[PDB]
Ligand binder design. Structure first.
Ligand SMILES: *C(=O)c1ccccc1
Ligand SMILES: *C(=O)c1ccccc1
Ligand SMILES: *C(=O)c1ccccc1
Ligand SMILES: *C(=O)c1ccccc1
Ligand SMILES: *C(=O)c1ccccc1
Ligand SMILES: *C(=O)c1ccccc1
Lengths: 317, 317, 317, 317, 317, 317
């Protein structure tokens, strides 16, 4: 609606205390506090940050993952009513900073790749779930609804957020453009899997996905990712073959403007930290002169989108 | 909600003092005391245990049952205000064991196939009536309503209870799954009726029902049953033909894990006793990796449940 | 509708030519001919029989499967208009036998766990896709929609077909009962994975699922299964460890009546053959005297089903 | 439909004889001949190559362009029945190479950014117009229909072609994926305008667009571009200010596989020539494992596309 | 199709020998000769020139016109096979000039406002009849046809011709633009009728109609008109009132470019003569940069034309 | 429908406070108040009046306009929910005068040339968008659809509105006539562009368009226009060359009757003010006698119009 505001955002390139919600929530709050001390109005965290990404489903067969990690991973997922979530809400309230942290929500016995949009006032704006996990990731997590695709009118800007390979979903992109994002939080895990063999998993592939999202939709993208450090190897890997599967590093946190140019100097693929940038929403009205997929540069008489935002439930009562 | 607690349960395979509430209540209390002595904190009892299952409706014409047993059976049914129910509550309190005993509740002139949920504190947690009695039981008993399908958050686990051939209701099972129960008490009568001719009434058929319930809903099932012993024959059977109808034995008390495997060595179809097993709720988070009907196998865009959990009464004041 | 007809049906317990469409189509046509000679009006084949079940997703990590089997499996999957499908239709026409063969349908670059239902006249009655794959099966197959849950009024009976753990989904089962299914074809793969340590995958668990389907819906279940033979070991696994993951045998094809009692002598778990039985629909009426989940023995005022059969498409046009 | 074929393709990074159809058609045929000598089954050329891109619309005001280049550009555009188009068809026939050349088609008194798709047999497979021009291009070109969004089944593969910022049209991309495009020709002009000021027009931005197209759709993208050679400066520019607006070079022709990795060594931005690669469609089925926007990785119950392929004309008669 | 030719045209503002075909054909041939001497490739003549426009329908009541002028005007109308038409064809052949002359064609007992189009070779290129006579001409003239709206590809340009208020036909004009005119001959009568009272009949109104035709379709409009000379008063008018009904002059012939600017200095409203101009078709491609109602500046998805070009005749054989 | 009402209208030849919504809305409200003091039932305002016309797209190259004016023009465009639009509604309600003011709508990140139709009751009758902008306007504005071509039954007459060079649209004209207009508001910008070089952009050409519209459709036309005064020169022009590109003046506000006669004395091309006239709808009934393009003087058996008036949306939900 309005493209005037100017503010500062933070993107977090960090690893979690693997499959330890209590330790990772402490790490998250410290990262929240650090960014707030820098005057940031929004801080974003990687995907499924709190318990950590379940790399065990990529490094070994399903039985190996199930036997050793499934119970531990499930036990460390956060229920929306858990105290850990309240700690994140309190942390955002105390430091007066909006937080977009990706958790592994637990609902009964199923897990979801949830993103918590926490306002600076400490309110939970939304807890959207990933519409569809990726490849073997579908054996761990369930699916979301069309209500999980939304854009929230935060006081500083209209905020949206998608998980990992939801940036390869062409129609999910358009639904988000149609709601007029101007700040997008893209959460990824450490994209160091199968690096020699599958280029699609390489940091290069996911940088085009994130850069194109900003370039295609004329939005600022706040890219946050995890890092596969040696601590990760001591957790998942059991031999040399598995260590090759999840290479080192894989973190590519970025801040990208509507023109696709990075607004913050990227960190190393293995280094952790936070990077900051100044967001001026007037930089979008400049980028929307050329292209606007949902506006002047669209042909609804030829191509249109059917978007269903109903919140379907297994039991409707 | 939480899948960490560990505890011990007991499944009762016993016969009652046929159509004798006072005598059977004593037998139940002794069984309650015996189970508590074994460290268990949940003892389940067969279906319509207190007065006993009314087999007379199966082994004779309706007039034979009405003329000889109806008044006796009705007179021995338990009203919720009767002293007998208080004895069961006191037994649970004194021995600090949760009791799930199926009784023949009496309300005015009608009977219901009630199940009493009693906690270690001696309070009546719930009193659920069978939603739909089996085809001939509908002459003896009334019908429950939506409020009778519920899952109760006991201190040790989320407990549910269903009666005979309520495990054949696809929608009732889904309602119970949707409420996230992890300990189920399946009350049965002696399933020896019409055994040669009607395979659906064999303990083999009812074992799949209980086993599938655990597998389908990833639940710990505590199956309890009545036994048709010779004492039963001297009560119901008046000739050789009726003895063939009522069969003999029929007890199949089990304790089934979320994977469908029995956690206790089953007794004989004619023997009596109490089973014991150790319940580790973490075993469910293993089972829910593979299946989760209300979680990640749900397709609410395709199939949903309308659950009307409102209690309806003949007079609404 | 009508429960008077009588006919003969066959359940195939066959192991395919692993990842070879042309070879397995020949094997299927040979099986079709054999059943027709025995006078069977319906022959059913295992799940994803034509190319064969992709056990490689269970034995090793995704990368091992993707690099070794993915392309071979994708290239051996049947397109609907492919000559292989036509050969199956021709075989059904020539031998005048209705066929229910589970193929790995290919649509573009995606695979679906389709079940082809072919009538005696050689027409493709149905092309249902699995509503949702199970665990890592989701990494290799897409999922169908509500139009895939249906029963088809064949000349001999009202036939429905589910495959694999679709029998663990209560809502899908009820939808099938609501459509008055009376002959059911339950396609399975060789259920021998993870036998010592994951009993939920053991043939014992999958036999209760199919048996309970007959009991709940009062239908004839023509259960068909693949077999994990030594040829499978030479194809998939290359270690002693992987040979344990993909166990031996796993076939449990059976014919189950509405009373839950088998109508054919079971083969061995490692034996490969065909089962036969005589179906008398009047047996269904006997079963429905006691239970009928969608009829006299239901509470639509308490529990109902929302069934959406819309045929969703990525592009509507 | 089939992902087995293998072939060789050529991408042209060429310089047009500005606003001279006859000479540029000669240069095209020589480029066509060179590719055929190397055994390429497909050679692609930049967008509006034959007359050349109208850079005058970007450098000066509309009146300056209209009074100087409009008539020259309009008179050098090819009608469909022109001798120049016949020469392109003859060259494709003679050299047995499929050609995808961008021309500025003339229809009456209007121009369109057309792409001619010519098979090895010398037939005009398709003549698609750009769905919507970009920014000030709309002052020199008209729009196409939904009939111009199509994928053509060439003998070697299913070929589709978009040009310029039709790769930023996210709904247009999905329509292409829905038709199972597997070889894509991306025609661009020399992307060197406003380089210091507008980064969205830089080759870096347009490489993420083409690379993301391959990743999203799992297709081979044959990116072909023009080059802003000093000859262009002598043609359009009249002073130093205009020479800055239309920067030098700007060519980024590339061949990239479904994994997003380049299959050919890129030339220099100012360099001119052709580059080659070997296309194996089996590489697509590897990419389809992880992502498939229109298949297994889609939620048609949530997001769908309305695609209108009607061929609308100003006069129906 | 081609916009490069250059040529010279003549617009005749002449008076007919009122209701005298033989003498008016002589006057036409002299005007044809004069234009050819000046090197004109096309000479156009007013509407219904050869017998002259029937002003008697306007001055007095129908009975007065019928009794005094109907038979004389009908007898002086030209048949297609008449010697007069042959003389016009011979004159065009001898002088090698294309002639567009308006006549009152006679077909049996009916008249039509025809426009003969004659090429330099003397052949009758076309014989088009007015689609609908304006207001009261409908009493003396019949309707035209859908085949009478056409554009003819003369050697010098694509020529079209419409009569009088046929320029107020929004749809007829569009049909002509769709056929890509670049030279239009607009034949008018002396527009001096009812001048004080009905301003819509003044030359001011008819000059905007012709000018806007050039502007909309970017065509050269060769406007030709008659003149109400005092000789006309001596023919039609018998009172002072009638001489007021048809004013004086009424001629407004001129040549208009696609920009709407006159290419020849207009004569006086009462003067007679010929107007000459040089037509450069390149002036159109310059005019079509801004507007093109049939090309880049049309919305066929919103508005389109149904053009029925069939030749309907009373007897179809 | 009814051709009897008589009322008074006002046409505005004004100048907006260039690219300032707040000050230009104040100027509009004063103009609205002034007209109502004269008893005018309708006041019309120029095209894209509220922020003003974006002349920067014509004077300089696209980069110069984008860098210097794009953000300013975008930021000063009115959102339909903005307070500025409410002020226009309040002004119409307060002064009880219908207002037809051309604004620059800002829907998300795109701009549209909209006509706001406001009734005397302060309600927003319609907000039609321009169907297709002209030449480089397409670089700054989007397109409307068929829902934007409509005639509104205002209490005083049937009113329609079209923007600059929608009066050169032959089919748009006919659609408007078919809906029985009798008051038309033609909004123009200051047509002082490229006056020496492009005659089509001069007020002479645009007066024929509006005048022909009245004559062709027999409707009252209320032409309103902006003025390029020295204030505009100090805003857009940066040197002498750019100062000639947008010449002084350009205002040609008129009120034209059904016969093409001007009902109000025109102002000077540089003068700024309002001009009034008295509208008698009976004057149309007199003009319909001669011509009626959609009625008695049409031939739908030959030429008819296809009008798709559906309201297309990028997301149809
Ligand atoms: C998406 O989140 C993803 C994660 C790991 C590999 C591929 C995709
Ligand atoms: C269930 O209670 C039941 C009892 C007797 C026969 C069948 C079912
Ligand atoms: C179903 O096909 C299935 C396969 C493997 C394990 C469980 C279920
Ligand atoms: C596309 O052709 C284009 C040209 C110039 C700038 C952006 C896109
Ligand atoms: C058209 O020919 C016409 C003639 C006279 C008056 C009006 C129109
Ligand atoms: C119409 O809006 C227009 C504007 C500028 C030049 C020509 C037409």
């Amino acid at each position: 609606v309005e493209y005037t505001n100017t503010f500062k955002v933070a993107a977090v390139q960090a690893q979690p205390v693997w499959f330890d919600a209590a330790k990772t929530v402490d790490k998250t709050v410290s990262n929240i506090a650090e960014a707030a001390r820098n005057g940031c109005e929004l801080v974003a965290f990687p995907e499924v940050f709190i318990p950590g990404y379940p790399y065990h489903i990529w490094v070994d067969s399903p039985l190996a993952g199930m036997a050793k990690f499934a119970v531990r991973y499930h036990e460390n997922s956060l229920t929306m009513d858990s105290p850990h979530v309240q700690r994140l809400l309190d942390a955002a309230r105390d430091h007066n900073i909006a937080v977009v942290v990706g958790i592994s929500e637990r609902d009964g016995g199923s897990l979801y790749m949830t993103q918590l949009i926490i306002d600076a006032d400490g309110q939970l704006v939304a807890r959207r779930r990933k519409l569809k996990p990726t490849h073997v990731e579908r054996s761990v997590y369930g699916e979301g609804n069309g209500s999980d695709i939304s854009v929230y009118d935060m006081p500083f800007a209209r905020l949206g957020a998608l998980n990992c390979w939801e940036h390869f979903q062409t129609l999910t992109k358009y639904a988000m453009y149609s709601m007029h994002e101007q700040v997008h939080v893209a959460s990824w895990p450490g994209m160091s899997l199968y690096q020699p063999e599958v280029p699609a998993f390489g940091v290069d592939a996911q940088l085009t996905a994130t850069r194109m999202y900003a370039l295609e939709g004329q939005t600022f993208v706040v890219c946050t990712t995890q890092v596969v450090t040696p601590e990760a190897h001591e957790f998942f890997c059991e031999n040399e073959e598995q260590r090759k599967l999840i290479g080192r590093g894989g973190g590519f946190a970025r801040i990208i403007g509507p023109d696709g140019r990075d607004l913050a100097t990227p960190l190393a693929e293995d280094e952790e930290g936070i990077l900051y940038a100044d967001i001026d929403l007037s930089a979008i009205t400049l980028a929307k002169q050329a292209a606007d997929p949902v506006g002047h540069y669209s042909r609804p008489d030829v191509l249109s989108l059917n978007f269903n935002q109903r919140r379907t439930t297994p039991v409707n009562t």
